[PDB]
């Protein structure tokens, strides 16, 4: 009773919560909410990220529906923003990405597992490599860093404090206080 | 163990486990080994078993029937299902039991695997023919007629030493 | 979170 | 629930679904719905079949309650109609059985498992044989094929397209477009 | 939502469904429904049976509350009526028991399991034999067959179609059409 | 489901079911219902019992609640009444206890499991013996039998039909018809 | 459905049930109910105890919120009151603690399990001993017994009837009838 | 293992496990092998077992009663129902027990599998007859009347060395 | 329905419960409730803690939300406040932190599990060390103790009652009665 | 293994596992074999065990008492429950322990299974009598009186080498 | 296997498993067996173990101390707490380690059972006394004072060959 | 089995399983036994294993380093992690591989359990030191400098026979 | 089922 | 169940 | 499905 | 439970 | 908890 | 079992 | 066990 | 363990 | 493997 | 391990 | 998604 | 099985 009520009353203020690992169901719900709030094209949409990551395809669906509409999307990071979470975080409208002072941002290149015959393993291997290159190019475009710099930095997992994230280019500014 | 091997040279064979493929193979191998020896010497089979499989049943019965030396059987503690007809399958005049023996006779139990009705019909017909063969085989080994077995075997029946002697399953009860 | 979101 | 809403409205129109293996619960619900719609003795009933079949007794309860009422029942096969599903599909009133162009029908032989003593196995064996004969006679009566032809074709599983089912007599006609 | 709605709207027509194995909670529910419908002392109560049977005590509770009240109980068998199901079927008001043409009725003999010391096994054995004799006498009284005839017939499971069950005394008449 | 509103409508007539093993939850429900119906002090409270028994403490709480109020409690046994069930059955107001003709009453002796060191096991042993003695004394007081007669009769499980339970003293009278 | 409106209407009479082992959830719920009923500072609050006890911390939270408020709390024990249950029972306002004649009260010494290195096990050992001393002192303060008497009687589990509890000091008085 | 066989050449038999088919077969094979030698030498058996199946129990009892040589039986540590009746089944006047030995007697416990009420009736009558034969044999081997055994067997009964000696289950308690 | 009702009517009084281990879901709920109550910039928000701990990122999200809003947050600890619980308890507005007389506070050191190759283990090791230093500095700033004192005291688990926690600096004042 | 067999010749018996039926059976089998080999030379028992059952405890104790030659016993590392009483059960004046030994005496523990309250009463009386016998027989082998055992056994008690020597469990501690 | 016994005849003992009852029992059985021959020959113990139980290591240590022949220890591969204390328990001047060996010292860890708080108090005092005794004994076999190793034992400490030599746990590190 | 011992008389040792405590102990015992004979005969180690533990790795490595006789190694099938470094640890000029052999080198993988931050820091520092020591010691046995070694080891690297020969892990590839 | 039920 | 309950 | 169902 | 609670 | 919260 | 088997 | 068994 | 056992 | 090992 | 152990 | 869906 | 196998 509490959760549904508070989520409804917050959504009434054009606020979307992403507080769980990204999968198909939550991605579909967020896409539906974004489309619904897209009815009014002159009001910004605010998205709060607290998630340890999720599937690639669902995150890319959310990313595409985020940049499809004219409505500006303002992302706020609280707690943890890792893997696909930080990718959605940095995908917001330029100049409108913020994080809390103690929020942590984890840059995490994709991981997956494959099985089958040699040809199937091959095909899935080039598909995974193409997906990784796609992610690297998108991150380089969004953050303003050079593509090879992002590729070098994304070889291992990297942790970022709010100020380091601001310096790197993932986040435009840091919420100090109300 | 050592006692089993030592009793082996005395032409004494234990049947103390459930009847199945391995035990039947061992029992019939021992029967063949003993008959390959002096064929004028009897072979004693001590039975203490709650029954078991069926193909093992028939294999051991046929092996006993084929062997020229007379084979005597002694009930021991309990003889049920397969063990009952092994005990009753000994040569006439050489079936024995202990005073506190416990003999059980019951019709065969089976579980036909699931499938389309043609397979179940085939399996059920085979089970019925098997049951008919067993009632005939037990009838020819006992004084009771076929119909008496028809009333008796429909449910489980339990006989003691004196009851088995009167019925005809055994020939004599051991006293001392 | 206003200002400025909301 | 949205699904409950759409089933409620479609039942309100005239329609009854069957989209899972036939068991006691779904058969009871379908029998209740048929009895409820039987209140009007003029409007016909429509039954949509998409199921891989189920228990014989539940299917026969549904068949009997279909045959009981004056209201004509029109069966439409969509997707898969197998085992008791195709029997119910063929159970519809003559001239009012239809299938979609890509509908697929499977004629199947009854199967069951048995256990117990010899006498119980016997009794259940004649019961299963009687059930099989009953089903074969009913199918021969409904489809118009000769009894030995039906019992010969039902020896093994047989697959049917829409046009093959129409030719065989299982289906009166196949629809193409609205 | 469908099942509850249809069951409610059928209950307003004084129709009771028994479409599952008989146990404690369903027996209490059916007893409550029978008592509720007993408020009107002239309208009869119609009970539909489709069940493979269940516990002895619950069935006897339903039986006692069935012949407690003045209201006539009309039993209709659909699908399968076995073990306690057929007992409840034949327990209806004389001249008001019916079955569908393809309904199967199974006369079955009680079965249970026992555990404990010798004295406990004994006591439960006489109790179970007394239950057997109670059932045999009750069904002999209801059907019209003699006690030993029922006892010999009930030694093993017995199957019945509509017509042979009708002539055996289990069922007064068989339904044909609406 | 039908159960909720049928139970509410029956409770509107001062009817309470005990149709499951006795534990803490059902005991709390029954005590609350008894207290609620105790608001009117001139109407009887009717308790229908069909249960195989349960924990001693919950049954004793229910018994104390029954004995506390001035409202007369009429206990009717249907189906099975065993262990704590028959105790609550015989705990009703004198002259106001009834059973159905085919109801079974099982006089049962308490059983429990013990664990721990040789000193804790002792204490739990005398506690269990004291509970046994109190149960025997209460049964003797309620049924009119002597202490030693109840003690010797309760050594093993004992079964009673309606009439011999009436003769024993467990039941005031047996129901015949409406 | 049923089982909740009774609790609502009993809470409307300032009655609180504790019918399950004491854990965090039930402790928070009872604390909230106590604070809610504390809005009116002149009407007493009645707490019914039937539980085998639970965690120490939850019971202590309930205890502290009981003696925080001005409202006098009256404890009634039915069935079983053990471990934390009897502590809450005896924690009531002096002169306003009662038990039913057949209720049982178990004085139980706290128990727990520890794991880890030597230092961690040490620290948790002194914490458990401090909790033991705290409980003994509080019980002695509430019941009027001396520290030595309580700490010697609580070495092992002890059982109490209503009258034994009254004599000891755990219960002010025992009720018989309304 | 080596001490077991080494004690075995001294006509000493251990019964240290639960009674079942395998142990009964092994122990009675040992009995037969030991009596195969001169029957003028006693066979000593030491009992330490919590009991077991009744059929194997009866098999061991019968094979003890059949052989001519007298049998010493000595309780050691603890002897439950089947162990108790084996211990009481020794040759009269020559059955002993240890000072701290524990003897326990209780009526047989059984588990009738679920099934047809006729099958349950047959199994229940068999259990009743088996138990009745059990106390008949126990009263035969003891000095107490059968009715006394009936009263004392309805629950578990535990006796010490002196209690067993007084009751008649034991003829002598060895001290040192 | 009781728990939801009481929680709603308490939330209408600007009271928030944290009565379970801190994870993502409860952290999101607390953040949403804090933002919702932040609509009025003059009324303080009261937060009650009975928790055994939880995750780090969720607790830091809650802490950042508490620090961001202009409304004063008054923290009350009852029962147990450990790990993240005591951090949130001491994170309240100065002069507005309280505990019940029998409240128990546990100062704890962060713990986690690591897996992977040497480089990943290394990176997560510095991340954990940085998190521990962050926590130590924050709690030293909030309580008033020096960094070295906190580091020495937080090496192992430490326990505090109400008064010694007040002396340490974790709690501003302890309440006794209403 | 080879070392156990080699040490067997010098009348040294290990008890390094939990006390149960099989280990106890082996123990008194070896004790009887050593009795047979020579009745005039002592038997040494090295105890390192956490405890075990009680019936096996009493069986080993009675075997030790019955053996005419004295039984040396030394504790090694850790002895509790059955191990503690068995170590205390050695011949007077000839019981030893290592300098870093660890002796534990604790009240017996069991598990009374689910059943009718009469059965639980019988089991409770039996365990209480077992407790009383154990304490009396332990106080017999020590200078401390019975009631002292009452205070000292109600909970677990732990004694080192010097503590055991002073209390009476151990006659002398081995130095080097 | 053959290599183990073959190395055994040259008075070489492996400890390559976790420390528990069976391994420790075998260890001091072999120690006593080697003691059986001339006491002028040293005993070499090769230690590669992640440690284990405390009572077992204490028993092995006591046996090592009781043996008059000097015992030398060689660490190689790894040595955890039990292995570390056994390795440091060798005779002075005869403790060696391989150049790339790893030594680990940490305070004892245990899982005290759930129970009455009095039982937990007793167990906690016992484990504290055990830790104090272990650290005192470790300080005995090293040049470092007791307070130094009490500080160094609070957490896990890992030392290499040279670090162990400097600390005092190893007399010398062998090279070729 | 017979061929293993038969090859064993010819100073040939198989390493065909995962590296752990038992296999390492067997290998080191065999190495010691072989060197106990005339130290002028080489020892051949045939390696086909996917790796294993690191402590056992080091034990076998420095056991090979300690003995005077030259140790030659031959790879078969594959050699990963522990197997690769053991193969590279042979006597210079005496490392061989088959034409289709596979060599895999990768940095150590660890599973550090849950604990406080201090424990994680200690374990992580130990893991880093272990990996640094391993890479330094591998660079010692190869012509490539340490810089190239920790450039290459960061991910998995797989080399064939010719690749291993060019890298410096193998002195010569077996042809026919 | 009318007629005649209902 | 009337008469007489209810 | 009209025409003709519905 | 009145009297006297409630 | 008033006073003073609430 | 002699006599007479064997 | 001699005397007297054996 | 000699002396003196054995 | 001779030549040359062994 | 000789020299010098053994 | 308008234009043009919706 | 002789005769005649073997």
Residue numbers in the entry:
A (entry chain F), D (entry chain A), E (entry chain B), F (entry chain C), G (entry chain D), I (entry chain E): 31 to 208
B (entry chain I), H (entry chain J), J (entry chain K), K (entry chain L), L (entry chain M): 51 to 226
C (entry chain S), M (entry chain O), N (entry chain P), O (entry chain U), P (entry chain Q), Q (entry chain R), ...: 2 to 7
What does the article say, verbatim?
The Clp protease system is important for maintaining proteostasis in bacteria. It consists of ClpP serine proteases and an AAA+ Clp-ATPase such as ClpC1. The hexameric ATPase ClpC1 utilizes the energy of ATP binding and hydrolysis to engage, unfold, and translocate substrates into the proteolytic chamber of homo- or hetero-tetradecameric ClpP for degradation. Here, we present cryo-EM structures of the substrate-bound ClpC1:shClpP1P2 from Streptomyces hawaiiensis, and shClpP1P2 in complex with ADEP1, a natural compound produced by S. hawaiiensis and known to cause over-activation and dysregulation of the ClpP proteolytic core chamber.
The shClpP1P2 structure in complex with ADEP1 was obtained at a resolution of 2.8 Å. A total of 14 ADEP1 molecules were built into the shClpP1P2 structure, with one molecule bound within each apical hydrophobic pocket formed by two adjacent shClpP1 or shClpP2 protomers. The hydrophobic pocket is located within the cleft formed by a β-sheet (βA, βB, βC) and the C-terminus from one protomer, and two α-helices (αB′, αC′) from the clockwise adjacent protomer. Most of the key residues in the hydrophobic pocket of shClpP1/P2 are involved in the interaction with ADEP1. Upon the binding of ADEP1, the C-terminus was expelled out of the hydrophobic cleft. Compared with apo-shClpP1P2, binding of ADEP1 causes slight dilation of the central pores of both the shClpP1 and shClpP2 rings, which is consistent with previous studies of other ClpPs. This may facilitate the entry of small unfolded peptides into the proteolytic compartment. However, our structure showed the ADEP1 molecules are bound by both shClpP1 and shClpP2. The calculated ADEP1 occupancy in the shClpP1 hydrophobic pocket (~93.94%) is higher than that in the shClpP2 hydrophobic pocket (~70.03%). The spacious shClpP2 pocket may not be ideal for stabilizing the bound ligand such as ADEP1.
